[PDB]
């Protein structure tokens, strides 16, 4: 039945936007998701359906809002019970990075259009909210095993550091880009606060137990995440100031919310840091050479500008 439905969708999707009927296309995607719930868990058609949809997603461009969101929701439901999607999220992060300009404002990127589903017009939370939702789920299940982790434990630690390490590269890609100023900026800082906390309980567990693999994760964590994150914080100042100009031309409420995650981002950095300090002395290893001193910012009231 899916085959009879795939033909209609690809014919509709390949057709010109004049004959689009996006309402049917959204239904054409939801029926796929609702009919993909009861496939054979180890069936070949499970893999075959995945091979087709990633081809369509990476080739076609579902310019419609829900069509892109709906199709992307489907592919993850199959790509959860079978594998981990951090490779896809990393790949998508490249396209949005290629879609816009970097935070540094002095570096350019090639087209690198690995997925055609995402494009310049889809830079909105259309995609960068869903993947962060998976980032929420990916870390949500990680806490469960870490809590259990608190003979095969060597395999347990190796797998987590692979997913977290790959995901750490992902966050590095987004954090260098100019994210849309909507709640996606907020949600990125909400998961960024969450991510550092999960970094702790594994280390907090191992206190009661040295490996260089853990150090290499920390070395990558310091190099590709922290200075970019703080620089990304400096980016937010420019974005909010420009965005706050749209004040119809009592902004107390908006200003507080627009910078609420920022302080707690710092705190989640140092609570991990304070216990990572604790580990270094108890672990007899100097882990701070890779990392950098925790930077901070001051302000200044422009008296002349008040005139």
């Amino acid at each position: 039945q899916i085959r009879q439905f795939q033909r209609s969708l690809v014919n509709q999707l390949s057709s010109a936007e004049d004959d689009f009927n996006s309402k049917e296309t959204q239904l054409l995607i939801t029926i796929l998701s609702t009919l993909s719930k009861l496939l054979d868990p180890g069936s070949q058609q499970f893999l075959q359906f995945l091979t087709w949809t990633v081809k369509i997603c990476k080739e076609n461009a579902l310019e419609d809002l829900s069509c892109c969101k709906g199709l992307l929701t489907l592919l993850f439901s199959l790509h959860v019970l079978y594998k981990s999607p951090v490779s896809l999220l990393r790949e998508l992060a490249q396209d949005i990075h290629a879609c816009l300009g970097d935070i540094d404002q002095d570096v350019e990127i090639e087209s690198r259009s690995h997925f055609a589903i995402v494009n310049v017009k889809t830079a909105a939370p259309t995609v960068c909210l869903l993947v962060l939702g998976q980032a929420d789920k990916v870390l949500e299940e990680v806490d469960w095993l870490i809590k259990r982790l608190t003979n095969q434990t060597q395999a347990l630690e190796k797998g987590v550091i692979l997913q977290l390490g790959t995901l750490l590269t992902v966050f590095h890609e987004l954090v260098q880009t100019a994210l849309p100023a909507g709640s996606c900026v907020d949600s990125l800082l909400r998961s960024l606060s969450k991510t550092y906390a999960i970094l702790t309980s594994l280390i907090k567990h191992y206190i009661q137990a040295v490996p260089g693999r853990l150090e290499k994760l920390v070395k990558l964590s310091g190099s590709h995440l922290t200075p970019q994150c703080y620089s990304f914080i400096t980016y937010v100042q420019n974005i909010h100031s420009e965005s706050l100009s749209f004040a119809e031309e009592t902004v107390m409420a908006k200003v507080l919310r627009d910078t609420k995650p920022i302080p707690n981002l710092i705190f989640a950095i140092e609570q991990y840091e304070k216990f990572l300090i604790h580990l270094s002395k108890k672990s007899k290893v100097n882990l701070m050479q890779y990392m950098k001193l925790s930077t901070s910012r001051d302000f200044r009231i422009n008296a002349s500008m008040l005139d």
Binding site: L81, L145, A155, L156
Partner: protein, 311 residues
């Protein structure tokens, strides 16, 4: 042979130490049950030894206090392990002792909630199953406990019925799984524990009309299952067919329809129940208000098909 020897060993533990001897005898029973699974005399020996140990623990309740800490530590270490039929049987037996049973019940509830949450997590993500294959199911062992203790045990039936009574209220997703588990264990013990059938029926009838404001759909479901399993149980539980109509016309949320359908064989084999419901019908239908008169007419309409139309 073994019962007196382990009784002497328990006396020695009372004189000596109990940290490891308890776990050792649990392990011995565990491998005995494993080797006997693939044994009625052995089961009678098991009943005798559990009776001896539960009597000893009831005499000295504080001696068994270390069991709680030991099992909590094991559960923290072992992910779902150590909840063998022997351990849970010992836990339920001392619950009937009425000493600190509330904390043991709370620990059991936390354990089963964690177990069903973990089962859902593993089912909803295979990536955790590959790295965490230690899928331990408390439901499987507790349901096997019904068959394990179905050989005339001293207090296994009482422990199981108390466990189910706590479970059904704990259910109030994880709540649905808890309700399903409680209903299944109650059905199993009703189909197994013959001499507690009347007591179980009376207790659930007392509980069935126990949550007027709160939903009791699970109650009516379990009552219907036990009645359809044993149609004449409530017949031996007489003087309650008339009693069950105390406040039936207060909160019809389909509860009245389910109750009527569950008890329908009793009405068609019990003329006194039919007469009493006829008497209640005059009061129900003549209620000037309309807040609850819908339940009366719905029940009467169902009854019209309840009685046969032979002739």
């Amino acid at each position: 042979e073994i019962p007196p020897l382990v009784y002497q060993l328990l006396l020695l533990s009372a004189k000596g130490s109990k940290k490891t001897v308890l776990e050792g005898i649990i392990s011995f029973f565990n491998q005995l049950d494993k080797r006997q699974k693939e044994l009625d005399q052995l089961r009678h020996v098991e009943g005798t030894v559990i009776l001896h140990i539960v009597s000893a623990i009831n005499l000295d309740q504080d001696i068994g206090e270390e069991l709680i800490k030991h099992l909590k530590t094991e559960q923290q270490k072992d992910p779902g392990k150590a909840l063998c039929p022997f351990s849970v049987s010992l836990l339920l037996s001392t619950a009937v002792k009425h000493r600190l049973q509330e904390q043991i019940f709370d620990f059991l509830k936390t354990s089963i909630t964690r177990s069903c949450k973990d089962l859902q997590i593993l089912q909803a993500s295979k990536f955790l199953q590959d790295l965490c294959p230690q899928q331990y199911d408390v439901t499987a062992v507790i349901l096997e406990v019904v068959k394990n203790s179905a050989f005339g045990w001293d207090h296994v039936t009482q422990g199981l019925v108390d466990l189910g009574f706590s479970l059904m209220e704990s259910y109030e997703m994880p709540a649905q799984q808890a309700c399903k588990l409680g209903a299944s264990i109650l059905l199993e013990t009703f189909k197994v524990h013959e001499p507690i059938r009347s007591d179980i029926l009376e207790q659930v009838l007392n509980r069935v009309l126990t949550k007027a404001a709160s939903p009791v759909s699970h109650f009516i479901d379990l009552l219907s299952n036990i009645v359809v399993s044993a149609p004449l149980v409530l017949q031996n539980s007489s003087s309650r067919v008339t009693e069950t109509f105390d406040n039936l016309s207060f909160l019809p949320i389909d509860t009245v329809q389910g109750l009527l359908r569950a008890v329908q064989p009793l009405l068609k084999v019990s003329m006194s129940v039919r007469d009493s419901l006829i008497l209640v019908l005059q009061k129900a239908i003549f209620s000037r208000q309309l807040d609850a008169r819908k339940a009366a007419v719905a029940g009467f309409l169902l009854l019209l098909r309840n009685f046969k139309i032979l002739g």
